[PDB]
């Protein structure tokens, strides 16, 4: 079940990104809405859900991937994005 | 080959990734389900199978590609991925 809050984890490489996504979706009730190949090795995984769930999920994901591969770049939470920012956010992963 | 465990190896360059894939699929009963060009030189190869098979396969693959080319970045196992993560996992190479 999706929600209003947004959780984002950026990693160097794909393996830590997948580990982070697994930990996030296991930890709390969040929906994985995107895995973005940013370029230059950056991978970002985005989740949506209610605020407490996203908070818990992002904390779990940050803990899980920090020692995997080249590790974690950023873990970020936005409790409510501006309505304009929704246009640059994926709805479902590809 | 059945089982839902996931094994992942990430390398710098394609040659160590191919060597890792060869070693993994020779070592144990796993299916090669994808090779991904991450960008910036990263390459990731993914295998599926039973938990013990994936453990053996990932260990063999990490051993084989360690000193090949620019080397190994990550070697990781997830015994059971969440159903959400399946949507970002390739099914066939």
């Amino acid at each position: 079940v999706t929600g209003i809050a947004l959780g984002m984890i950026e990693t160097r490489g794909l393996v830590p990104a997948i580990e982070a996504a697994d930990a996030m979706t296991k930890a709390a009730e969040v929906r994985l809405v995107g895995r973005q190949f940013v370029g230059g090795g950056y991978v970002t995984v985005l989740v949506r859900g209610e605020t407490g769930a996203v908070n818990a999920a992002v904390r779990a994901g940050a803990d899980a991937c920090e020692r995997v591969g080249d590790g974690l770049v950023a873990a970020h939470i936005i409790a409510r994005v501006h309505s304009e920012v929704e246009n640059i956010l994926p709805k479902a992963p590809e | 080959v059945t089982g839902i465990a996931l094994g992942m190896i990430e390398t710098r360059g394609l040659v160590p990734a191919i060597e890792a894939a060869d070693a993994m699929t020779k070592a144990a009963e796993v299916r090669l389900v994808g090779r991904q060009f991450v960008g910036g030189g990263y390459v990731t190869v993914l295998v599926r199978g039973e938990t013990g098979a994936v453990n053996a396969a990932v260990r063999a693959g990490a051993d084989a590609c360690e000193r090949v080319g620019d080397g190994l970045v990550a070697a990781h196992i997830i015994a059971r991925v969440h159903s959400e993560v399946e949507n970002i996992l390739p099914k066939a190479p």
């Binding site: 020692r67 | 453990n55 063999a60 051993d63 196992i77």
Partner: peptide, 20 residues
Amino acid sequence: RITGPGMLATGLITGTPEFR
């Protein structure tokens, strides 16, 4: 004592129950 693929890549794998 027990040989085989389980003795390979010590200290390189990160998904294992020991790692977690």
